[PDB]
Design a protein around this nucleic acid. Structure first.
Ligand SMILES: [Mg+2]
Lengths: 23, 66, 101, 452, 1319
DNA sequence: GGGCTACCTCTCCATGACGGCGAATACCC
DNA sequence: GGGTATTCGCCGTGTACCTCTCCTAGCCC
RNA sequence: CGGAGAGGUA
């Protein structure tokens, strides 16, 4: 019975400009 | 120039801590290059004594025996 | 600007003169930030190009060396020979102007 | 990692390998069941593009995550750049046994020492105090001693004074430019919360005491205590590596105190009286019978060492001032007297320490620098060298010069309306006459300050 | 004249200029913008109505169904403000929307719909604005800063210089929409006009005209004129207007009428044009090679055969001119191309063009925009129609239509939103004209091209994005939805709209957590003009252009106040008097100047309207009804100072404060400071901390009243009257009869805000500044907030300062403070920390908040009750246990502990509980006390307001049917049933009775409603059971290491706290409080602090003279003489106060409020000179030069050279020393690298970074570096062996390899790169 | 609103840096 | 075809630190 | 004990 943790992963860079690099 | 005379080195780790890591590890990867750990920064990376200061006598005693 | 700031800080500055001096100071601060960034980039490149140069031997035994002279551009002598050759081992014998002395 | 709220965070590698394993399993299922060619071509293109999204994601910003279409991080981004491993976690590491606070002056220090607060001293030295507490036998285990310094009992502070005494620390201001940016001192404990740094040494850090925050490091092992004492002690760096001049130049208050101390006015008390030595010059100035600067013949005794290392004593009556004698009590034996007979601003005191180091070695230059700092702050305090608004004298000739320049730009204004001169000739003419009037006002104020 | 409360302490105001316009309300950008956002707007201009009328009606993909719009409405918020900051929710009212669904029949495009349906649907929760101008997002208090981005419209920029290193300056044109796709015209050094879209790859700029349905002949018809040749006798003639010949070298003999006009070799003179036009010459003869360099305009097909002789845009040759000389094409049209006047750019670009027709051009654009897929005609038409010409995916605003019409020299400033053919073609014509030398480029640093967005506009745009996501949701569902089985709340969703607007207000680059530690800090954080954010620039990529100040920031953006460091000039501060225009640009007040008279009307000017007129300077010496007393006045015409005529100007500046901001109009003597120390003075004034005792600035400006009133920290009386009751909790104001409503009459009750946490852990506090029984006026202060005193703004405290180098304790920039200052508790700031302790539901069991804790004794449980939470007011120290909490493992201690090194008193305990957990005893105790306080608060509301209403009824029956004895036989309820006439009086009694019955009903329903708010459970995070919050409140005093600073960029760290004797002291005996260093004066050119020091010495000189005239208790005549002399004093000012109108306590209480010192103003650039300070010191018994002989405290003898003393207003900043101090023996270590953690809060270690490693390499240090990066970090084995060796007493090390290097081998080895280790 | 189950790849988001250096075509005889 | 330009693509852009906030979508219940 | 962003310090 799967509640797979990859569906709970925090998008921890949710404030970055999408054009910045290396992260 | 200094940004090129540090990449074109016989020691790929000192050229890897500097600019363009990808180009240095590809050129050092297709050649099978072998870094002797000779110099300051390569030994600050790997965590042994620097062969400059107090540790220079240690690299005398080490370079002598082996 | 063809109209200089004719008043000093002990007297009062009026509005426009203080405004122009504000432009000067902001050019100063914005120069110090970006100048500091390029300075740190310069120190990074220089300590990573030298980076392994270790004084290893007491003597290599060579009879070479550059020729030091005091620098002159057309004004006064800018740096004398004493400051340039203070503490640096000679290449060959320094001759007195008397021959073979 | 576990966060809080029934929700987890992690690196982006797990997401990229999740994507690659999904494309590889979908390719195994589509080639195991004999798909048509165009579907497995789109498949292998997505797998090649997935691995090319994993090994380096910078070259194609394709790998995107939810609610904010950003490029994900990858292995080449784990190694490259400012925040990879080489510059972030291998050349420079976060280092234990350290601390950091705000600096402050406290000039009662010798220059081979610095202050350090008791709270930081106990927090930095918990292992040594543990070892001494179970060495003298005041505890059994490590947890009893951990209760002892967690409680801050009364006996731990003599233990702390018996682990400080000869142990260096390393002070560090945060933008370290040159090799004087890290030096090593010996602690003196401070009831306070601020590192008391020696004043002269402050000029090496390019520091100022408006809230700079210096960090201490502890040399744990024995060879590092000797590398701190023999190479990095604040006495063993009194010349710059960049130039052979001193770096322990007395900075701002102390040269004002010396410059106030060695000068002369033409008429003060004790004018033209003879004095038997520097000792009664101090004894005259402390009472008030003389002034600190009034010209006086004295008998000084200088020791010029022109022999083979043995000092030759000679004595005479130099025509000097009283402040120069009070300073002459401090200059050590080998220097000549003529170094203190001038005004002694910043250049002359810089070459004073330069000649002291180049003649009498190291230790008279350390102790001579400490004595210069003590007498410079003391007689700077006796100076009271203030600043008032009536101290800056406007030229009386200023408005006349500015009015003449106004008449001259009126002249060139008329010559531009008369069509004889060009715009650029008006430009160079106006800047030249304003520069000349500027220099006339500057020489007016400079004379009217310096000689009035 | 002054009110009874304005006369408390009247500030002696120097200042020469009579003022005309008062300071406007300092928070008008936030309140006017968000007021503009959420308010019922007719005609759909701005607000929510512009979004709703923009996206609606939604109508499906020809499904005969349509969702149309009616109106909207917002209900009450569920919470008031204070309970919402305490609880943590948004302060947000819900958005109710009245939609309407209509559905047509089959085959009724125009027909009547068959079924309508209508309800008021819910979408989102748009957060309101608290009345101070802030938001509350998740319990905190946040500010959205106004953005300064580029104006939509057109921009013909240069981009000169550093392209291609040839000096040939390029030119580019950019049509920036407000919302939609970009459009960039530009050139190249092969002189070819190119276009690109949304910064993609490049297209030749005539292919868009090939997409706009234009033939080649129509393109060359547009960008060029015609040159007419005729088939005639021989050597085909040429029509000639001689203006075309201007500046040419004639390569043939120009002659006509048997007359040689121009010989070959000589240029066409102006006299040659006068000869050909004066002789009226039209037709001449050309050589046949002269036309051979020309390009034919239109096509010429063979009439006989049906073929093409010459195509359009083809150069002519002699043989081809024989090919068309034989058929009879009479009108030969060529395009006049001249390298100096009329450039041949479009012809070259048509030669670059691969395409011919409309379709292949649309294939090129469609292939460029969406690459990879095969193009199609319908997708190309839908693409190109939906890049520029549709209402949906492209829109200039009315601002974009204004700058777009204005920068083409059009006529109308109101037009369409979408582009047109004439828009793009006039852009290309204007760009070719700018290339041809006529016209000029625009600059982006000019504030006529930067527009201010604000909270209302950006929230309108994010709400618009919520509406386009919900229109793709509805256009999905309504296309599939069929019948009346759906109602318009099943289709629509709350998650995209509320997720979008919570994503904007929640966190962005423009939702700053408000720097709330100071009223100046709020009121200068809200007036902030950021250049960052979405749509504008970035921090690490700006240059020397946008960061540098420009000659049109005058009066609009403050030049001297900006943050220093990375963002300098990108976080610009708006001025004092400046406003936002109707379109969004900045504008500033000026006074209209008629031909002789300076008219005292004000008249706002934008940035470009200043550039036309000539504008006077503020400090121009004037007269009576208004004539400039000089015959020439220093002015500025077009960004250039000059000295123009006496009567040539058009506008005079309003006031001399209008160039600085309110962060900078609080520095007295600003005109004497270099702008560096003025800047650092404005920043450090922004970061003051509030003291414990608010103490007035001696040397102020007069902007202190406007800041302390206009911020939201004081309790401004809404209606003036008589104070009925004064308490630390509340202030109850009885209202005068004039400003009083007939119905809802009552009185006013102000609930002050007592000790609660700020955003920066300072203590916002309100204290009453009026006493019982005192007249108050509408617009006066009643409660001084933090850092305010009697309505002024008082940030720090003012102390006796000397300027002398004192024994090296003030070496670089230090400060030395006596024991007097720390004894009198006058920098002793009060901090409040908030410590959470959550009760998580984890694996292996829930968490209890019990007191049964192992490993601790009675020292832990001595300070708890039986529930386990600390008492209110039990004075904890570091290490004590506030909240007991254990986690089952028998069980492990996880109790909340006070962080190390702080003291203080638990002032308040919050308890939150998930709905589903039974409460412990203490939570029922707190809930009980909150119920008793809510019932007591509302019951005292009904008692005091009952006393006001019934006392008003008793005040009515004084006259008009008075029954004095019958009034208080029966009680205060039935006072309407007494005998009285039928007039306005008994009707007014019925008004008051219906008011009181409404007070009964509203009291009861708010009582049970308040029990519903307190009693119920609360929403929390998922997985937490109960949260206990504990408010510590430290009282931090002063110590060596704190930072203090005055208001001129004189920083300083207090270094030693000396005894009272060790200070210097003058011959009267008073010790000086703080001794600075004089050497900060000549280098850091801020001479303003010395004049502040002298004028402060004058202020306290008047203070000590009144103090001797009042401790001896002289009669009021002597005090009236002296106070009147002190307020007259010198040159003509604005103040002119007369003490013939004070009634002998208004003298005496004024002198009670001046005996500590007399407050003196100084406006920014119109302040006191030296001579007024010298005469004011002559009024005191003080020396003229401001210098006093002082006696050394240690030695007891006179300093030579008498030192400067005076009173300087000094500040304490919140960079205190017991936040900066941290140390680590051995704590916790990171997970992926085995390095110590980073920071103080995470108990971590300092970073011995890269340059420090170069420092230890630069010595002979190796072992120090070896243990500095192998033992003390990055190796678990070496540090455990090290710790064992140190507790043993042996000093050695097992180095090994660092762990992070062994991670690096896995991150290179986990690529396809073998990395190894030999031997 | 919200608790249980899960993306096992869809469209316009975007749009204000500059220098430098070297490689990969563009082109001119 | 061989040498020379021209566009195109990558790499880079100062250290140390202190606070705070903020972290999942869809959907059929 | 995970990383981003925002502000601030030198
Ligand atoms: Mg500093």
């Amino acid at each position: 019975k799967y509640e797979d943790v990859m569906h709970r992963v925090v998008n921890h860079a949710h404030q970055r400009n999408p054009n910045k690099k290396w992260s | 120039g200094i940004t090129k005379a540090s990449l074109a080195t016989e020691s790929f780790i000192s050229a890897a801590s500097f600019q363009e890591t990808t180009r240095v590890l590809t050129e050092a990867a297709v050649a099978g290059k072998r870094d002797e750990l000779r110099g300051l920064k390569e030994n600050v990376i790997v965590g042994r004594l620097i062969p400059a200061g107090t540790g220079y006598a240690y690299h005398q005693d080490r370079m002598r025996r082996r | 600007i063809e109209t200089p700031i004719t008043a000093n800080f002990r007297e009062g500055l009026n509005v426009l003169q203080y405004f122009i001096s504000t432009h000067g100071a902001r050019k100063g601060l914005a120069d110090t930030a970006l100048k500091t960034a390029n300075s740190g980039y310069l120190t990074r490149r220089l300590v990573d190009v030298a980076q392994d140069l270790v004084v290893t031997e007491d003597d290599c035994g060579t009879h070479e060396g550059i020729m030091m002279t005091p620098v002159i551009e057309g004004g006064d002598v800018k740096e004398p020979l004493r400051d340039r050759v203070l503490g640096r081992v000679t290449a060959e014998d320094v001759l007195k102007p008397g021959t073979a002395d | 990692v576990p966060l809080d709220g029934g929700r987890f965070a992690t690196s982006d590698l797990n997401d990229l390998y999740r994507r690659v394993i999904n494309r590889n399993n979908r390719l195994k299922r589509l080639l195991d069941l004999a798909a048509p060619d165009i579907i497995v071509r789109n498949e292998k293109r997505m797998l090649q593009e997935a691995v090319d999204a994993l090994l380096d994601n910078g070259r194609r910003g394709r790998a995107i995550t939810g609610s904010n279409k950003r490029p994900l991080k990858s292995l080449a981004d784990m190694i490259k750049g400012k925040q990879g491993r080489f510059r972030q976690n291998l050349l420079g590491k976060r280092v234990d046994y350290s601390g950091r606070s705000v600096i402050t002056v406290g000039p009662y220090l010798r220059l081979h020492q610095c202050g350090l607060p008791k709270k930081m001293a106990l927090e930095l030295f918990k292992p040594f105090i543990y070892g001494k507490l179970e060495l003298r036998g005041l505890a059994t285990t490590i947890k009893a001693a951990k209760k002892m310094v967690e409680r801050e009992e009364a006996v731990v502070w003599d233990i702390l004074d018996e682990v400080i005494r000869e142990h260096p620390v390393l002070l560090n201001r945060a933008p370290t430019l040159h090799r004087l940016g890290i030096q090593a001192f010996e602690p003196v404990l401070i009831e306070g919360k601020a590192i008391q740094l020696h004043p002269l040494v402050c000029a090496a850090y390019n520091a100022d005491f408006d809230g700079d925050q210096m960090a201490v490091h502890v040399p744990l092992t024995l060879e590092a205590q000797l590398e701190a004492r023999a190479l990095m002690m604040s006495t063993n760096n009194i010349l710059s590596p960049a130039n052979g001049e001193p770096i322990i130049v007395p900075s701002q208050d102390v040269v004002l105190g010396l410059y106030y101390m060695t000068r002369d006015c033409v008429n003060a008390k004790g004018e033209g009286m003879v004095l038997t030595g520097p000792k009664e010059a101090e004894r005259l100035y402390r009472s008030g019978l003389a002034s600190l600067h009034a010209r006086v013949k004295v008998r000084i005794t200088e020791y010029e060492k022109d022999a083979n290392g043995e000092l030759v004593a000679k004595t005479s009556l130099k025509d000097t001032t009283v402040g120069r004698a009070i300073l002459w009590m401090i200059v050590p034996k080998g220097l000549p007297y003529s170094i203190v007979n001038q005004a002694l601003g910043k250049k002359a005191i810089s070459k004073m320490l330069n000649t002291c180091y180049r003649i009498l070695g190291l230790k008279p230059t350390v102790i001579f620098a400490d004595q210069i700092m003590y007498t410079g702050f003391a007689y700077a305090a006796r100076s009271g060298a203030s600043v008032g608004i009536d101290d800056m004298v406007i030229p009386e000739k200023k408005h006349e010069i500015i009015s003449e320049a106004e008449a001259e730009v009126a002249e060139i204004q008329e010559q531009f309306q008369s069509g004889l001169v060009t715009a650029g000739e008006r430009y160079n003419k106006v800047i030249d006459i304003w520069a000349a009037a500027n220099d006339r006002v500057s020489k007016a104020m400079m004379d009217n300050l310096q000689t009035e | 004249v002054y009110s009874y409360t304005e006369k408390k302490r009247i500030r002696k105001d120097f200042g020469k200029r009579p003022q005309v316009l008062d300071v406007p309300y300092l928070l008008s950008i936030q309140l006017d913008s968000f007021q503009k956002f959420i308010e019922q707007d007719p005609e759909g201009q701005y607000g929510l109505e512009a979004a709703f009328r923009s996206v609606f009606p939604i109508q499906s993909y020809s499904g005969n169904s349509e969702l149309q719009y009616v109106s909207y409405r917002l209900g009450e918020p569920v919470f008031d403000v204070q309970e919402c900051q305490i609880r943590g929710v948004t302060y947000s009212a819900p958005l109710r929307v009245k939609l309407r669904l209509v559905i047509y029949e089959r085959e009724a495009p125009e027909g009547t719909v068959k079924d309508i349906k209508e309800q008021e649907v819910y979408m989102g929760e748009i957060p309101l604005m608290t009345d101070n101008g802030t938001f509350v997002i998740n319990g905190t208090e946040r500010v959205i800063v106004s953005q300064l981005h580029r104006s939509p419209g057109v921009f013909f920029d240069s981009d000169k210089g550093k392209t291609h290193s040839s000096g040939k300056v390029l030119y580019n044109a950019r049509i920036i929409p407000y919302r939609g796709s970009w459009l960039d015209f530009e050139f190249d050094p092969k002189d070819n006009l190119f276009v690109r879209i949304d910064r993609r790859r490049k297209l030749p700029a005539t292919i868009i005209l090939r997409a706009l349905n234009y033939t080649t002949e129509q393109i060359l018809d547009l960008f060029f004129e015609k040159v007419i040749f005729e088939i005639r006798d021989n050597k085909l003639q040429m029509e000639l207007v001689p203006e075309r010949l201007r500046g040419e070298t004639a390569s043939f003999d120009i002659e006509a009428n048997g007359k040689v006009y121009v010989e070959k070799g000589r240029r066409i003179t102006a006299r040659h044009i006068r000869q050909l036009e004066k002789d009226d010459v039209k037709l001449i003869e050309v050589p046949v090679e002269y036309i051979a360099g020309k390009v034919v305009a239109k096509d010429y097909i063979d009439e006989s055969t049906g073929e093409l002789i010459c195509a359009a845009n083809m150069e002519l040759s002699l043989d081809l001119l024989a090919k068309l000389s034989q058929s009879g094409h009479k009108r030969i049209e060529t395009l006049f191309t001249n390298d100096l006047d009329h450039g041949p750019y479009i012809s070259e670009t048509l030669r670059v063009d691969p395409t011919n027709d409309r379709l292949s051009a649309l294939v090129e654009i469609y292939r460029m925009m969406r690459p990879g897929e095969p193009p199609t005609r319908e997708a190309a038409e839908s693409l190109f129609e939906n890049l520029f010409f549709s209402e949906d995916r492209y829109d200039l605003s009315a601002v974009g239509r204004m700058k777009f019409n204005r920068s083409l020299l059009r006529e109308e400033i109101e037009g369409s939103g979408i582009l047109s053919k004439d828009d793009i073609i006039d852009v290309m014509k204007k760009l070719i004209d700018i290339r041809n030398g006529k016209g000029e480029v625009d600059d982006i640093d000019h504030l006529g091209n930067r527009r201010i967005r604000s909270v209302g506009e950006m929230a309108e745009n994010q709400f618009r994005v919520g509406l386009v996501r919900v229109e793709r949701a509805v256009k999905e569902r309504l296309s599939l939805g069929d019948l009346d089985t759906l109602m318009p709340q099943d289709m629509i969703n709350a998650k995209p709209i509320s997720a979008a607007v919570k994503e904007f207000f929640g966190s962005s680059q423009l939702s700053q957590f408000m720097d709330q530690n100071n009223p100046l800090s709020e009121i200068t954080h809200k007036r902030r003009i950021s250049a960052l954010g979405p749509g504008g620039l970035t921090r690490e990529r700006a240059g020397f252009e946008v960061r540098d100040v420009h000659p049109t920031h005058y009066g609009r953006v403050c030049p001297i106040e900006t943050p220093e460091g990375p963002n300098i000039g990108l976080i610009n501060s708006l001025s004092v008097y400046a406003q936002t225009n109707e379109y969004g640009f900045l504008e500033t007040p000026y006074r209209k100047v008629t031909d002789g008279v300076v008219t005292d009307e004000i008249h706002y000017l934008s940035a470009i309207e200043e550039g036309n007129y000539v504008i006077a300077q503020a400090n121009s010496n004037l007269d009576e009804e208004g004539h400039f007393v000089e015959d020439l006045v220093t002015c500025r015409s077009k960004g250039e100072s000059s000295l123009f005529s006496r009567d040539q100007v058009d506008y005079m500046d309003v006031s001399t404060q209008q160039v600085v901001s309110v962060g900078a109009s609080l520095i007295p003597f600003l005109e004497h400071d270099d702008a560096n120390r003025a800047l650092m003075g404005a920043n450090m004034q922004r970061q003051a901390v509030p003291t414990l005792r608010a103490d007035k600035p001696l040397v102020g400006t007069g902007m202190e009243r406007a800041v302390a009133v206009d911020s939201g920290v004081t309790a401004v009386a809404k209606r003036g009257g008589v104070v009925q009751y004064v308490d630390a909790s509340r202030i109850v104001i009885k209202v005068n009869e004039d400003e009083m409503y007939p119905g809802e009459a009552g009185i006013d009750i102000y609930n002050l805000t007592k000790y609660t946490r700020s955003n920066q852990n300072t203590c916002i506090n309100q204290m009453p500044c009026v006493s019982l029984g005192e007249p108050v006026e509408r617009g006066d202060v009643l409660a001084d907030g933090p850092s305010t005193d009697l309505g002024e703004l008082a940030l720090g405290q003012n102390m006796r300062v000397a300027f002398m180098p004192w024994n090296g304790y003030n070496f670089e920039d230090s400060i030395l403070v006596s024991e007097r200052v720390v004894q009198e508790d006058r920098f002793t700031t009060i901090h409040i920390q908030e410590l959470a302790c959550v009760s998580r539901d984890t694996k292996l069991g829930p968490e209890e908040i019990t007191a049964d804790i192992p490993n601790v004794g009675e020292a832990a449980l001595s300070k708890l009750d039986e529930s386990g939470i600390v008492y209110i007011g039990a004075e904890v120290t570091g290490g004590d246990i506030l909240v007991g909490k254990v986690t089952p493992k028998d069980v492990k201690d996880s109790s909340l502990r006070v962080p190390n090194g702080v003291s203080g008193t638990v002032i308040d305990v919050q308890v939150f509980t998930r709905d589903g957990v039974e409460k412990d005893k203490r939570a029922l105790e707190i809930e009980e006390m909150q119920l008793k306080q809510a019932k007591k608060d509302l019951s005292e509301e009904l008692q005091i307001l009952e006393a006001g209403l019934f006392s008003r009824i008793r005040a009515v029956l004084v006259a008009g049917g008075v029954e004095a004895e019958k009034l208080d036989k029966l009680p205060r309820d039935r006072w309407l049933e007494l005998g009285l006439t039928d007039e306005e009086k008994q009707n007014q009694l019925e008004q008051l009775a219906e008011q009181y019955d409404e007070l009964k009903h509203e009291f009861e329903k708010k009582l049970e409603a308040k029990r519903r708010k307190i009693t119920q459970g609360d929403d929390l995070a998922p997985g937490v059971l109960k949260i206990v919050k504990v408010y510590l409140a430290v009282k931090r005093r002063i110590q060596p290491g704190d930072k203090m600073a005055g208001r001129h960029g004189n920083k300083g760290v207090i270094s030693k706290i000396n005894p009272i004797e060790d200070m210097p002291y003058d011959e009267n005996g008073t010790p000086v409080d703080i001794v600075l260093n004089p050497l900060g004066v000549p280098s850091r050119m801020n001479i303003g602090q010395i004049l502040e020091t002298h004028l402060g010495m004058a202020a306290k000189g008047i203070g000590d003279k009144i103090n001797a005239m009042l401790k001896q208790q002289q009669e009021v005549a002597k005090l009236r003489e002296f106070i009147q002399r002190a307020y007259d004093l010198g040159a003509d000012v604005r103040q002119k106060v007369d003490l013939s109108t004070f009634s002998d306590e208004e003298v005496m209480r004024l002198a009670e409020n001046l005996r500590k010192g007399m407050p003196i103003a100084t406006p920014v650039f119109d302040g006191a000179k030296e001579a007024e300070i010298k005469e004011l010191l002559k009024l005191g018994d003080l020396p003229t030069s401001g210098q006093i002989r002082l006696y050394d405290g240690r030695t007891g003898e006179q300093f030579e050279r008498p030192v400067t003393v005076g009173y300087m207003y000094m500040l304490k900043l919140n960079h205190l020393v017991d936040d900066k101090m941290h140390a680590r023996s051995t704590g916790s270590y990171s997970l992926v690298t085995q390095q110590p953690l980073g920071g103080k809060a995470q108990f971590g270690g300092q970073r011995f970074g890269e340059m420090e490693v170069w420092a230890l390499e630069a010595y002979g240090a190796a072992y120090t570096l070896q243990e500095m990066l192998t033992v003390k970090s990055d190796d678990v084995n070496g540090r455990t062996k090290m710790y064992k060796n140190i507790v043993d007493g042996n000093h050695q090390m097992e180095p090994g390899m660092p762990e992070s290097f062994n991670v690096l081998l896995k991150e290179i080895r986990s690529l396809g790169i073998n990395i190894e280790l030999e031997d």
